[PDB]
């Protein structure tokens, strides 16, 4: 869907997460090159066991179920965030995050 719209959705994430060039870890891990990556593997971040040992691989499908209700998909996770319930927002959110390569550069 719409990346430009996803950027506005991402603003709730921006508080804890960084994306794009020069992104660094904050309260949450950097989200550059998220899709396809295994959960709990961004270097330098202190993940909870819940996240680190979950065995999840981030695909669009799994990401959509997770962002809807984080604590439901990863009980005990440190990401105390309510989640994004809107079907359209999630699709735009995905479109926005997918533009980035692991190094922050735009595809």
> By the criterion CB under 6 A, which residues form the site for ligand HEC?
12-13, 15-17, 27-29, 34, 39-40, 42, 47-48, 50-51, 67, 77-79, 81, 84
The nearest distance, CB 11 to ligand HEC, in angstroms, is 9
Q: Which residue number, 22 or 44, has a Cβ lying nearer to ligand HEC? A: 44
User: What is the longest distance spanned by two Cα atoms in the chain?
Assistant: 34
| The two structure tokens encoding residue 104 | 């922050």
Q: Which residue number, 51 or 92, has a Cβ lying nearer to ligand HEC? A: 51
Phi, psi of 106 (to 5 degrees): -85, 130
Quote the CA–CA distance of 59 and 41 in Å, as a whole number. 15
């Amino acid at each position: 869907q719409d990346a430009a719209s996803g950027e506005q959705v991402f603003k709730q994430c921006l508080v804890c997460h960084s994306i794009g060039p020069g992104a660094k870890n904050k309260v949450g891990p950097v989200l550059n090159g998220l899709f396809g990556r295994h959960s709990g593997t961004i270097e330098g971040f202190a993940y909870s066991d819940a996240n680190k040992n979950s065995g999840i691989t981030w695909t669009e499908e799994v990401f959509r179920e997770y962002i809807r209700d984080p604590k439901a998909k990863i009980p005990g996770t440190k990401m105390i965030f309510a989640g994004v319930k809107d079907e359209q927002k999630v699709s735009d959110l995905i479109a926005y995050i997918k533009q980035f390569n692991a190094d922050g550069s735009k595809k």
